[PDB]
Amino acid sequence: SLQFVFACISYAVGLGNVWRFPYLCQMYGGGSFLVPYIIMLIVEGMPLLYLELAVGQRMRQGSIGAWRTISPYLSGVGVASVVVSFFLSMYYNVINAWAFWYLFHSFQDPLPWSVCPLNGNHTGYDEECEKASSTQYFWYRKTLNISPSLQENGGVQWEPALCLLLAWLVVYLCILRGTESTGKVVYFTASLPYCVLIIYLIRGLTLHGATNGLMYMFTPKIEQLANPKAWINAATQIFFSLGLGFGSLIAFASYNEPSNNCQKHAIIVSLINSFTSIFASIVTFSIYGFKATFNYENCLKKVSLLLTNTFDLEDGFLTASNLEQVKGYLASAYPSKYSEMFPQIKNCSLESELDTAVQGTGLAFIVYTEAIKNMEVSQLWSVLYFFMLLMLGIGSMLGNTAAILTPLTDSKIISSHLPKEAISGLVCLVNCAIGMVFTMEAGNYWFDIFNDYAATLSLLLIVLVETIAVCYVYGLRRFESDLKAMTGRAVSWYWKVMWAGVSPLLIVSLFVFYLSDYILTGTLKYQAWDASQGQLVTKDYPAYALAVIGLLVASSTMCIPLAALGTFVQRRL
Amino acid sequence: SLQFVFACISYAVGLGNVWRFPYLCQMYGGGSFLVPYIIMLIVEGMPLLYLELAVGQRMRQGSIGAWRTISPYLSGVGVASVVVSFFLSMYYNVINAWAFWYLFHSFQDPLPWSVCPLNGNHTGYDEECEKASSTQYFWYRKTLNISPSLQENGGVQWEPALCLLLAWLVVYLCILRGTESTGKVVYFTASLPYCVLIIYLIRGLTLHGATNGLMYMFTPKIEQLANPKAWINAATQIFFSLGLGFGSLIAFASYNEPSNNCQKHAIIVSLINSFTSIFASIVTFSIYGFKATFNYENCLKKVSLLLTNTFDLEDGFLTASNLEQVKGYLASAYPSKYSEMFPQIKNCSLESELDTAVQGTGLAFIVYTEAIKNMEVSQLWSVLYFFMLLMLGIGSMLGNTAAILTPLTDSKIISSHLPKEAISGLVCLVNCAIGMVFTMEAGNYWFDIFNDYAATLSLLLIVLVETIAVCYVYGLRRFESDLKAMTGRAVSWYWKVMWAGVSPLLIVSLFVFYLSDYILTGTLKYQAWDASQGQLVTKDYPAYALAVIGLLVASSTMCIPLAALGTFVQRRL
Amino acid sequence: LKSALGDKAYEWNDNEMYLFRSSVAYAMRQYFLKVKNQMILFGEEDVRVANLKPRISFNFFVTAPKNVSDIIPRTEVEKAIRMSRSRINDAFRLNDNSLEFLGIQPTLGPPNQPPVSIWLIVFGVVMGVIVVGIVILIFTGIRDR
Amino acid sequence: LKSALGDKAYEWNDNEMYLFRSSVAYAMRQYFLKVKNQMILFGEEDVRVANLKPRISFNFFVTAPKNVSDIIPRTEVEKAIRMSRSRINDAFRLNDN
Ligand SMILES: CCCCCCCCCCCCCCCCCC(=O)OC[C@H](COP(=O)(O)O)OC(=O)CCCCCCCCCCCCCCCCC
Ligand SMILES: CCCCCCCCCCCCCCCCCC(=O)OC[C@H](COP(=O)(O)O)OC(=O)CCCCCCCCCCCCCCCCC
Ligand SMILES: CCCCCCCCCCCCCCCCCC(=O)OC[C@H](COP(=O)(O)O)OC(=O)CCCCCCCCCCCCCCCCC
Ligand SMILES: CCCCCCCCCCCCCCCCCC(=O)OC[C@H](COP(=O)(O)O)OC(=O)CCCCCCCCCCCCCCCCC
Ligand SMILES: CCCCCCCCCCCCCCCCCC(=O)OC[C@H](COP(=O)(O)O)OC(=O)CCCCCCCCCCCCCCCCC
Ligand SMILES: CCCCCCCCCCCCCCCCCC(=O)OC[C@H](COP(=O)(O)O)OC(=O)CCCCCCCCCCCCCCCCC
Ligand SMILES: *[C@@H]1O[C@H](CO)[C@@H](O[C@@H]2O[C@H](CO)[C@@H](O)[C@H](O)[C@H]2NC(C)=O)[C@H](O)[C@H]1NC(C)=O
Ligand SMILES: *[C@@H]1O[C@H](CO)[C@@H](O[C@@H]2O[C@H](CO)[C@@H](O)[C@H](O)[C@H]2NC(C)=O)[C@H](O)[C@H]1NC(C)=O
Ligand SMILES: *[C@@H]1O[C@H](CO)[C@@H](O[C@@H]2O[C@H](CO)[C@@H](O)[C@H](O)[C@H]2NC(C)=O)[C@H](O)[C@H]1NC(C)=O
Ligand SMILES: *[C@@H]1O[C@H](CO)[C@@H](O[C@@H]2O[C@H](CO)[C@@H](O)[C@H](O)[C@H]2NC(C)=O)[C@H](O)[C@H]1NC(C)=O
Ligand SMILES: *[C@@H]1O[C@H](CO)[C@@H](O)[C@H](O)[C@H]1NC(C)=O
Ligand SMILES: *[C@@H]1O[C@H](CO)[C@@H](O)[C@H](O)[C@H]1NC(C)=O
Ligand SMILES: *[C@@H]1O[C@H](CO)[C@@H](O)[C@H](O)[C@H]1NC(C)=O
Ligand SMILES: *[C@@H]1O[C@H](CO)[C@@H](O)[C@H](O)[C@H]1NC(C)=O
């Protein structure tokens, strides 16, 4: 009966594990971001999930109902957890939208991203498609057509709008046909991702210069480990990938698990999450090292050609090594021609290029599409990989939607007029109509604005409130005795210390150091595309930027003290 | 519960249906052989099978036991039926041997029959491989190395010997692991042949000039319908393909079928046999018409090239049509050069070529291997088709072996010392050691000697004896009443007349006309390979040829009057 | 031309004959440089052409540069053409069957790569699994009697 | 040569220059026959070559057959080369890059 473990993996695997993790890893050197991940996981990944599953089996009640019965001070954590996932779903659906788009654009020969367009003269390729590669251009222009600045709001684009519409429609269909999609089918949906990842690992590992990718991803470079931004980002990636804080897990083990063990189950799920992350982040980086070394060799060959053309030299004389020697020998040759061309000599090195080659929030897309054009058959692997990604996305999507469809339908006041199908349609409708914003020309700016902050700050506050409450408002020994009574086992001091001792201190120390290094530099610069050059410049935020993040974080996690105040006023009459 | 019909097809499909039928069809014009087949099938194919299945359900006893209980005059028909299949198995196994061989020779690139060898000068291809095609050479030389005459016995060849050994070994394994191979697996083994035949039909139907093959196979040309040889050959092909006379069918419905209907079952099986034959004989002949028209176009282009080279003419001037016109215009041009080359002008026409292009007992091999080299991938379709053929062969093989393993083990005198595994090993051993003869250099001559006659004459005698006995020794009305009593149905006069009225007369009239037209011409000429030219010349039989066919037919069907005599002497003491 | 280039062939005017004479002169230069170690300046007017026909076909022969009575023997011209045939073909887009130098045949086409006649090893492994199944089955049969 | 033919390239001696001059003369003949409708007998000695370098590179220009002071304008040589470029490439096994 292996079905339980495959069901557990189904619970586990999401899209912050396969898509967000590689991007966030690359964003901070990789090797100098990987070790912090393991650290924060070992020290606050496991015990928090243990505690949450334990209290979920204990109370056997809804998210809001559990914290209502626990304490009066704890009325707003449930509604905060609901609105968090509510805000999540909107900007979460556009990823499925893009996967749909790339799938639809793969029924051809050749693939549209595989060849650059032509100029008006029909002589050479479009230089816009040459500064960027054959893929990056297709990503930032064809499917996005982003504006180089944020100040250019612009008009709504309609192809991604339509694709997002279809995504929301298929979401609605999957939710409307029952609150289940597993059972005798879990094997298929749980084995597909691993299988395609193995195939793509075999592919991307027989690619030249792939070793550089792994070498760069693994080496720890101790210069940004002293930056707490990577620390908080890793902590948040773990929190968001494990579904904690959202309340889906505290609600999953409510009408289930009479007296089974939560420690073993949670340990399996957390280990599988970490293994999925660390494995899926190896194929991408092998391929990314391949892309980096190819770009480097191309730069080298181009400058060698310019050199052998300008003065004169037997072809094949400046290949890869003697260049420097030649570079010297041509200095004393005739500097009256050498100095006058020196400002054109391109100066490119491998590690500097490998640092920033494909970076950005669309990393997975640009690297995978670059790897698919290198296959033997193209449409097949394309549609297979994109179907895998879309299926994982829709699975995570329905998982997220459960945690919001359930806690709104149980209240007997709101579900008196309309049944569930009606309110489900209304929420899908408002969700699409608000997420249309990312379809705008400068929509990816809103996307990267939303993602990190709305996934980080509110969740980090709610989890700390949950822990400090369950520990120092209910009593550790009381819950220990309750578990000893319900299951017949004694908790180890291992969790006894880790539930209130270390993690509550470490998380707030990291938060304070994050908010303190925020004032050591000033305001922040996000990104920009610079189509004229084809790289990622670092334009600054506009005025209303800070304001909109302020309202985001406020509306996301300023609800717990409001329930604390409501308790104060409801005790006075 | 569709399993019964697929079991019936399993009972039905053999190798005289897929391999022997196309060869025998081509041997006599095809269209002028197809209609006689339908005639003899409708008039004596169905009712004889009906009668046999009926009496098998009636007696519910062994082959020899049934005819022992029926009448005393009927003791030798069982042993004759046994020795017939015994003689069959030997020369039947070499086909599986050849299929194994061709399978083993298909794990390469390119396929060995696809390219001709070189000469010692390394300038042009071996002319031996050019007179014959790239396949015919591989068939008559590589896997056979036949001698141009029968008088050249020669030494034993060892590669086909070894392959036949492996064939007998796998026969022994399949028989030793139970007396069954079906059950929840019948779908696969019954659907494989049809599926591959559909694929090969789709292939061979998108080949240029394929219409000529079907057109030739279907048109009746009324010049050999007046030859009774085609008549007897078609009758025998039907008899041998339907497993009658061998006793396997009279024994199959013995420990089975308590009171079910035999008419419907036998009708289904006979219709399915005929449909399988007529369908499988369409893909081969489409491909064979393709091969014919290709050979014709090649002849035409070669002579056009010789013409345009010898005098002088703009290239591309003699393509396919104006040739005759040109052929005229070059007569008055300079006959002092035209007459002196006229004896070299090749004179080739489409129908004369299509008459004899691949004819011979290896027809299926030479045409299918020629069709496989024309595929997109080669090893795949090769091994698939040969595995299909080998599986059908081994199925028919175990079916044949059952009808001889059963009736020898029931006698309590012979099965007192040794169990079944021992005697099975002994019979496989003697069968291999006698079938080694076909491995000889001039072994195919022995093969074609055995096939037609041992499959025709003995079977035709045994069936007529069976019919005349069951009708005019037991009484038609008596058996009619017995069936009315056992099953509760009244036989139609349809079978009442056809069991003794028409078929007993027609079969002996055809036999007499066959043996009468044998003396209107004299002795017979069989075939010959003429490696020096690459066609099929018609060498005459040697002296001992007639003697060996005489002993074959005697030993095969001179056992019924011997039992009639044994009854005479066992009534005198 | 019709055979090789199909429905794409160029027409054969006299500029094609000029290019052909130039190709043959180059082929002779190369041979006399790389073998005889001399250096002779053949031109396109030392290749004499005769009997031009429409089915495309003619004779030619090569003389010394200015000594018109001096004719390079046939054997050496054949040698010099074997050496550079693959280049003269490419100059006209022909493939050694649409450009025949009667009396010169190409004979470098030998295919051979069977290491062990690999059919035999597959037969052997199949025979091995056959005999191991047979022995296991006679084992199980005679034992359980 | 090293770029195109890889580890198969021929060396470039003066017979290659002879063949190149012959190819260009043929290309000029064809153009003047199929466009100007004239018929001029250019030879391999009406293609003047200058500044031969080892990185393979030189200048050339074409004159009338025997009137050495008569130079075909640059534009017409470019036209005549566009017309037969795919043939000059094939003569040397080069691919337009
Ligand atoms: C991808 C994103 C979009 C996906 C797709 C979303 C679209 C789904 C949205 C569906 C919205 C409508 C759901 C239809 C449900 C079944 C329709 C049906 O059965 O109708 C029968 C039927 C429809 O009309 P018929 O044509 O006569 O059958 O309605 C009735 O006759 C029942 C009588 C209704 C009584 C009205 C009084 C109710 C309120 C009382 C006073 C309080 C007012 C507050 C109202 C509460 C509203 C919040
Ligand atoms: C996307 C956003 C998601 C939103 C989802 C949130 C859904 C639940 C929001 C409310 C949760 C916060 C709890 C606040 C406490 C309720 C206030 C109150 O009781 O009023 C005092 C109220 C008096 O307050 P006063 O106005 O100050 O006098 O007491 C009453 O007399 C009300 C009578 C109760 C009527 C029974 C109705 C049964 C439905 C209740 C179930 C709803 C809770 C869902 C929990 C599920 C677990 C089973
Ligand atoms: C490489 C992929 C993962 C490899 C592991 C394969 C699967 C391991 C199965 C887990 C074994 C547990 C089986 C069931 C028993 C439950 C365990 C238990 O009772 O715990 C309470 C157990 C009870 O001990 P007590 O203190 O005597 O009560 O707690 C412990 O003392 C064990 C502490 C071990 C800490 C975890 C192991 C690693 C810690 C050291 C630093 C690790 C470096 C990280 C680098 C990793 C690189 C990949
Ligand atoms: C590859 C060739 C295949 C060969 C397979 C043929 C196997 C059977 C061959 C014999 C069939 C011909 C029937 C001839 C009649 C037998 C002669 C006779 O009875 O002797 C008279 C014999 C007297 O003859 P006398 O020598 O003239 O006095 O009567 C006896 O007293 C013999 C005592 C009988 C002993 C019982 C033995 C039980 C085994 C008998 C079963 C064998 C028949 C198989 C049929 C299966 C149906 C159940
Ligand atoms: C591909 C074609 C080839 C396929 C492969 C074919 C090869 C299979 C052939 C197998 C032949 C041998 C079968 C072995 C059967 C099991 C062996 C076994 O269990 O032996 C135990 C055993 C073998 O010797 P062990 O090494 O002491 O075990 O034999 C005995 O000890 C039993 C004592 C035997 C008594 C002998 C007296 C029997 C006859 C009495 C007088 C009448 C004489 C007439 C004889 C009748 C012969 C027709
Ligand atoms: C094309 C593939 C085959 C097409 C046939 C599809 C399947 C047919 C299912 C058979 C129908 C029988 C269903 C069950 C009833 C049993 C029949 C029955 O009762 O028979 C006794 C039935 C009883 O009649 P009674 O004489 O009144 O007792 O006998 C007959 O009278 C029917 C005679 C029909 C003869 C067979 C049909 C063809 C004969 C005419 C010449 C045929 C030309 C051949 C050329 C063919 C070209 C392809
Ligand atoms: C690549 O390296 C060369 C050599 O270091 C750089 O040339 C130097 O450029 C700096 C300006 O940053 C000058 O101050 C130095 O004088 C230059 N070196 C010499 C020897 O003159 C070159 O600038 C680098 N590439 C780029 C794009 O800056
Ligand atoms: C192909 O057809 C031609 C024309 O019919 C044949 O030439 C005739 O051959 C016969 C011999 O069988 C002579 O008697 C005739 O005189 C020939 N015709 C003429 C016009 O002279 C030719 O023989 C045929 N091909 C072959 C191989 O025989
Ligand atoms: C032109 O070539 C011919 C032969 O190819 C040369 O004739 C030879 O001349 C020498 C002396 O001049 C004689 O000894 C030979 O016997 C001649 N050979 C033949 C075959 O007759 C002739 O000399 C050459 N002329 C020039 C100017 O080089
Ligand atoms: C050689 O070519 C030059 C120019 O290519 C010819 O010069 C022309 O001569 C005519 C009269 O002879 C003058 O009217 C033109 O003005 C001249 N052109 C130039 C550009 O000066 C010259 O005639 C040609 N010589 C021959 C013998 O054909
Ligand atoms: C060639 O195309 C370029 C496009 O950048 C254009 O600027 C230029 O004018 C064109 N040249 C001609 C001669 O049309
Ligand atoms: C690189 O330059 C050095 C210096 O002369 C030379 O020895 C070497 O062969 C050159 N390598 C290549 C590949 O040209
Ligand atoms: C060329 O090969 C053939 C083979 O038929 C042979 O008869 C002939 O002598 C060979 N020619 C030479 C010159 O070796
Ligand atoms: C065949 O010959 C006739 C007779 O002149 C001619 O009209 C026709 O074009 C020729 N066809 C071909 C394909 O050469």
Numbering used by the authors:
A (entry chain D), B (entry chain B): 11 to 583
C (entry chain A): 624 to 768
D (entry chain C): 624 to 720
From the paper:
Angiotensin-converting enzyme 2 (ACE2) is the critical cellular receptor for SARS-CoV-2, directly binding with the receptor binding domain (RBD) of spike glycoprotein (S protein). The CLD of ACE2 is reported as the chaperone for membrane trafficking of amino acid transporter B0AT1 (SLC6A19) and SIT1 (SLC6A20). Here, we report the cryo-EM structures of the full-length human ACE2 bound to the RBD of the SARS-CoV-2 Omicron subvariants BA.2 and BA.4/BA.5 (hereafter referred to as BA.5) at an overall resolution of 3.1 Å and 3.2 Å in the presence of SIT1, respectively.
And now, the BA.4/BA.5 subvariants, which share the same S protein mutations, displayed a higher transmission advantage than BA.2 and exhibit more powerful immune evasion. To reveal the interaction details between ACE2–SIT1 and the SARS-CoV-2 Omicron variants, the RBD from SARS-CoV-2 BA.2 and BA.5 subvariants, respectively, was mixed with ACE2–SIT1 complex at a stoichiometric ratio of ~2.4:1 for 30 min and applied to SEC to remove excess RBD. The interfaces between RBD and ACE2 were further improved to 3.0 Å and 3.1 Å, respectively, with the focused refinement, supporting reliable modelling and interface analysis. The interface between RBD and ACE2-PD for BA.2 and BA.5 is almost consistent except that Arg493 of BA.2 forms a new salt bridge with Glu35 of ACE2, whereas Wildtype (WT) and BA.5 retain Gln493. Additionally, Val486 of BA.5 retains hydrophobic interactions with the Leu79 and Met82 of ACE2. The BA.4/BA.5 subvariants exhibit higher transmission advantage than Omicron BA.2, but the interaction between RBD and ACE2 seems quite consistent based on our structural analysis and binding assays.
